[PDB]
Paper text:
MATs are an essential and ubiquitous enzyme family found in all domains of life. 38 MATs catalyze the condensation of ATP with methionine to generate S‐adenosylmethionine (SAM)—an essential molecule involved in numerous biological processes, including RNA, DNA, protein and small molecule methylation, polyamine synthesis, and production of enzyme cofactors. 39 Analysis of available crystal structures reveals that bacterial MATs are predominantly dihedral homotetramers (D2 symmetry group), that is, comprised of dimers of dimers 40. Two deep cavities harboring active sites are located directly in this dimeric interface, making the homodimer the obligatory functional unit.
To enrich the structural dataset, we determined the crystal structure of MAT from Lactiplantibacillus planatrum at 2.82 Å resolution, making it the only current MAT representative of the Bacillota phylum, and added this structure to analysis. We also found that MAT from Lactiplantibacillus plantarum (LpMAT) does not require chaperonins for folding and activity. Similarly to NgMAT, LpMAT assumes a predominantly dimeric state in solution, its interdimeric interface lacks salt‐bridges, and is less hydrophobic than EcMAT. Since MATs from N. gonorrhoeae and L. plantarum fold and assemble in the absence of chaperonins, the folding dependency of EcMAT is not a general inherent property of the MAT fold.
Residue numbers in the entry:
A (entry chain D): 4 to 101, 125 to 395
B (entry chain C): 4 to 99, 121 to 395
C (entry chain B): 3 to 99, 129 to 393
D (entry chain A): 3 to 101, 129 to 393
The structure:
Amino acid sequence: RHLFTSESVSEGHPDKIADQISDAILDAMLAQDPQARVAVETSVTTGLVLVFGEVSTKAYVDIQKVVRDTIKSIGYVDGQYGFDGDNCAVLVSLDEQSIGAGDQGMMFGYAINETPELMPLPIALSHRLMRKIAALRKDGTIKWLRPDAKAQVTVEYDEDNQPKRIDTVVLSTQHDPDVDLDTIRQTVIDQVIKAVLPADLLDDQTKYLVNPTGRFVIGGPQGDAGLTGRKVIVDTYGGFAHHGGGAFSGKDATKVDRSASYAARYIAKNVVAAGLADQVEVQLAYAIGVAEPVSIAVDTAGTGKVSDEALINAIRENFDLRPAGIIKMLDLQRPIYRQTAAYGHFGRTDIDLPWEHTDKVDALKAAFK
Amino acid sequence: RHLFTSESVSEGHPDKIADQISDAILDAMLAQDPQARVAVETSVTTGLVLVFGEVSTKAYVDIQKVVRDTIKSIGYVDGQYGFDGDNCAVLVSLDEPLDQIGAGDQGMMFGYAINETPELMPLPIALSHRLMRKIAALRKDGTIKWLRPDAKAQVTVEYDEDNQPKRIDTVVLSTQHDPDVDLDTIRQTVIDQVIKAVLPADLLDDQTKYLVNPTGRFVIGGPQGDAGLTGRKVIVDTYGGFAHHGGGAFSGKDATKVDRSASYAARYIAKNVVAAGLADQVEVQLAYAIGVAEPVSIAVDTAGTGKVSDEALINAIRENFDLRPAGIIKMLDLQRPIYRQTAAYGHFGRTDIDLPWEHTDKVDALKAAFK
Amino acid sequence: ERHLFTSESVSEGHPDKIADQISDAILDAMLAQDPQARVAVETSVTTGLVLVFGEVSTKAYVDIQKVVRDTIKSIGYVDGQYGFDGDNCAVLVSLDEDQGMMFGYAINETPELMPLPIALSHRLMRKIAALRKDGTIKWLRPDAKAQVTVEYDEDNQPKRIDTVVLSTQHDPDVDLDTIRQTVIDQVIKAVLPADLLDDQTKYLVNPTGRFVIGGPQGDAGLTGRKVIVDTYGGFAHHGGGAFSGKDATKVDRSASYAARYIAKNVVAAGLADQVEVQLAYAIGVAEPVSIAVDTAGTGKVSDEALINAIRENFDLRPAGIIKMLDLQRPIYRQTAAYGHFGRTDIDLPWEHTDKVDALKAA
Amino acid sequence: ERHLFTSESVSEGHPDKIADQISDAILDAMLAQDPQARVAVETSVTTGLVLVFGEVSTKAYVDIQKVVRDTIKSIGYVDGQYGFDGDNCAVLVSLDEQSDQGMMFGYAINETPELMPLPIALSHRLMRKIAALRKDGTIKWLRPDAKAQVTVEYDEDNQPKRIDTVVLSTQHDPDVDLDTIRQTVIDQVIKAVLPADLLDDQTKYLVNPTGRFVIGGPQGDAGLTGRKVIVDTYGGFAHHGGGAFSGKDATKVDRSASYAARYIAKNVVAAGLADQVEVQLAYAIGVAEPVSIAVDTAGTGKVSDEALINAIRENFDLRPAGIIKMLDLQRPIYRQTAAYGHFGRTDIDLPWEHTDKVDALKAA
Ligand SMILES: Nc1ncnc2c1ncn2[C@@H]1O[C@H](COP(=O)(O)OP(=O)(O)NP(=O)(O)O)[C@@H](O)[C@H]1O
Ligand SMILES: Nc1ncnc2c1ncn2[C@@H]1O[C@H](COP(=O)(O)OP(=O)(O)NP(=O)(O)O)[C@@H](O)[C@H]1O
Ligand SMILES: [K+]
Ligand SMILES: [K+]
Ligand SMILES: [K+]
Ligand SMILES: [Mg+2]
Ligand SMILES: [Mg+2]
Ligand SMILES: [Mg+2]
Ligand SMILES: [Mg+2]
Ligand SMILES: [Mg+2]
Ligand SMILES: [Mg+2]
Ligand SMILES: [Mg+2]
Ligand SMILES: [Mg+2]
């Protein structure tokens, strides 16, 4: 029985709090200094936010205000949650310091026509569940919802490895303590899960598990811990793709780890959007102090409507893949990163990310003329 | 040109300092309480070690002593380096059949093995690990007294049309050193006593690029200029990006965490399959459901190197491995202090230490399943 | 020119007192299992944070996190609406493994033989706290402060009470007029002696106004930054140690307790109306090398003769003081708020007047 | 019975003084750009750690990390030798952004030219000398952390009769034996600073009686802002309202009125209106002027107490705002006070140590 599970987490999850803080600080600095170099880790545990890293910028930023404001947007805005943007400890250890690649790295991109956003079905549905739960909290539709939430979607795959059905949805949400489990369960199933899962993939055997922990009143960093870059699979493709092993949040586009991974997605997505494959993993190899990627591999899983060598050729001709090139190409020296630090860097329908534009379709179509 | 790069890092790298501390605390507790539940993150920056997490144990452990002792073994001792086990800040924020123990995460875990190396690991990650382990051994036995703990290796292997390892294209190796040694000496010494001591001669040619400390001088390192966190070397810890990920991290977690135990089990499978000659390579894929001991689903990718059916191989695995969380713990004897040693130079492919999930003692069981 | 003198006291809830009580709660925890425990434990508290740091040497097993969080809960920080909570705040722990002057003071201004300003300040903070904790006033929150200005006559006798300033943390659902009338009636008028009050006595309750979030939230607190509050409200001189976080091995603490024990017994015996006792220790000499005494000419006896009675009736060696006052017991958390001296509400050995007959007889 | 009195001072290197200097270095940094800067900055220091925390409200842009690490380097913790280092130690920062019915006491006494009690003054002079000798490189084996305790013997009339005991403990490189440490401190520090006319063959000199002392600063110990208040003031000769100075801008009457109280005491005694005086200021909530001024001359008054209080009300602006203008306190002048005493300073120029109100008081 071919079953595959992917997870996503809300803005409220401690690991995502860390990622959003790291990227909020990045935005704050790019907002004043497009040239800002940034390398900012965040750690969060019971009542604590430690920010630490190197930075090099002309920008003047009140880190405390950025951290506390980020935590408030997420929804931690009164002490009944245990965690509060105004009342939590914030400790800061920042150093201040004011082409060609710096890492001998591998970066991977992926796309697949399983969903309109060209993402695998499990990660895409997980993301849509966390984004819906969050929207329902924030617009005030469900007043008892608290920030921290998690979804795991198990999809059952065919003989052809096509998505046959949805086997299990696990969804856990933080809530006000004045709401009983039966209400939380019925409400999530009805207004979150059944609002987002396509009806044609559900049957009477689909398992819906809401808050299997039971009550979940105190959350965020309170019982738990959270760190920058511990939701890499959530951040990318839910484990459909390979990894060079950087993490994104807290890093400016100077970091090819981040910029080439965005570029790799841009390629994969345009290839599949153009119909040149049903799925493709793009593999970029950089050498230290060589701008151009030293090597480009491509895996279509034999869904390629074109040669592998011919596809690699189209990509070398229509994408600038030098670190500097990618920055100009995707316009990455702008404060666009806080919004990526929850609900996935890839497959985003709710916000406009440059590497999700399908504006290289005509360029690629034309390359076979 | 089909090129593929993997990195490994020394005990001295800040991310690995974090991983070793988290797992040193785990060992300390298992050493007194095999039943110890542990979830311990570590963060390290300039002169600082923050330890934080949940724990539940009958053990009495001096966390400060464990952290400072771990940092000293790594080699940060007697105040030379700017990071020191005796002199650094340490802050601690700690909270306080075999069927019916089912899984807690609705997770995916992956295992991998490939006959590219005797340890049955991909060539890039394996060589990277061997370089960091050699540099470390040479420091610690005192063969090269000017070496400092923090070091990094990136090995680029060139693959032919059939994706077989053709040659070694580039080795990048950066090491921390005493400031009284010039770059030319560092470079010639690393090339001769580390790289040429470890890279198989038959994969080297006059076009192999050796870049040692391409940044230049590297005197202050560890957490000093940098930052390090538990579970930010997951690719280093596993298969150098040859395999897929459910997205746990290992260090700081007791074997109660199926994220860790099933990943160990998945390697044990993959390695025994390939060791038995039932494939040249296999990725093993385990799917667990919340509160179901048995994996709900097992997939297997041989890349058409399978000497046996996929359905028949999955069958042999279900018959010869206990894959219940509790089962894996008994099977691999995981309630022992065996984890500090995994937190640098890879969890997989280890020839220098004895890890249960690296034993090839299920070969005859699997061979026998096809006669 | 009006001879006015002001002293302040602060509640368990004040951030500096939170620090002092945590440091001393950890000390008690260890003495409770190991009377020989050596302890030197500083605490710092700011927005949502408690850093504990210091040296310790003990056979005791103590969960520091549990001690810190339990201390903070007793103080009354027990739900997140206060901003500060024993369950939800950050707790960081950094625990490793004198040629001095000390001063004592006593004065017959109050039955406890303390200066009137510090004594009244302490009684106000102790009453406000009792009223919160027994649930008499449900809208009170932990953090509170009192400043009592006493007017002194010619002869420097307490003539009247000029001003009482009292500021308390409260639930936000209670109006200022209610807070003021309630504190005046159930705290101030319950504690200030009527014979020292007149129609000119100024009562200022929460002159800042509303005060809903407090403790370490807006502020900062450190171990040993309420030394004047802890002692005699500025009537006395200081060698300049602080008490909380230190076992009785620290002569800074033990000799200061001993100095009070002397002063109090001298004045209780009627040998003076007031006395400051001054103890000088030399490094590696058990006995104090020198004892001075200032009666402010209220001495019923010679200074040299009084010093003589003290040398004859008190063991003043560090070891001696520990045995004499039985100081290797967990009795210190109690002292870390509402004053080390003049305590009628708890039993401290250095407040016993059991050496009166010994000094009368001399 | 022998009337003996001991005061201590500590070096820049002592952990409590490291905390005080960091808190005041941050204050200076902000006043340097914003004279109007409101500041309330605590520092804590333990093994390899500096936590900075407090409220602040300023137009100034300050790299706190750079200020902390630079302060620690001046103190002498500079090249990874000592186990505490300005470049290698942890620095954590928790600063919030916002852009008293008190007693304060002053004291002066003609026991020393600076008009300070002899014990605290001599203690300060020993720590300042030990520090100068380290920093100018005269004694290369000295390390930052050091402590002095001076016991003075007093007469029946409480006049300084002699110096009974000097205790001085210094941190040192481990390659130097105790006999060298002792002879060097006695010769180049103690005998360089103690007035010969107060020494006799009974004067006890104890140098490093503890023994070896190679690791110090915050390493084995802990240090906090405002735990050297007696050292910072008058060595226990005076009374205390119970503020601490370092980390606080002059907006804090705790600090500004204490400076003002010293300014008064010193000018009174400098004018010869008394041999010693303790000045006592009482402030009431919402009254700029001190509500009450007491004065204790210990019967050394050459004038009435009521007449002296009158001269003080007529010649000093004692309103919080008044004191700031009077002593020009909205300037970066505070880092220098955070070691070797706020009062009696001969080596630096502090406004509250000027004796420029003598003629005003003489004339009254
Ligand atoms: N001047 C230098 N020259 C060379 N190497 C250095 C220098 N300074 C630091 N390093 C090393 O480079 C490391 C950073 O590499 P890396 O492993 O990428 O860091 P990371 O903090 O784990 N981030 P990332 O891999 O991008 O997700 C440091 O931890 C040191 O090991
Ligand atoms: N004490 C708790 N009570 C209730 N729910 C909790 C508690 N602790 C954790 N959780 C929930 O479980 C989540 C942690 O699970 P997970 O997403 O695996 O995070 P992680 O362990 O921080 N990261 P990783 O190891 O990289 O997979 C929390 O964010 C909550 O959703
Ligand atoms: K966690
Ligand atoms: K880093
Ligand atoms: K101290
Ligand atoms: Mg985590
Ligand atoms: Mg990287
Ligand atoms: Mg890192
Ligand atoms: Mg998980
Ligand atoms: Mg304070
Ligand atoms: Mg002292
Ligand atoms: Mg101390
Ligand atoms: Mg005050």
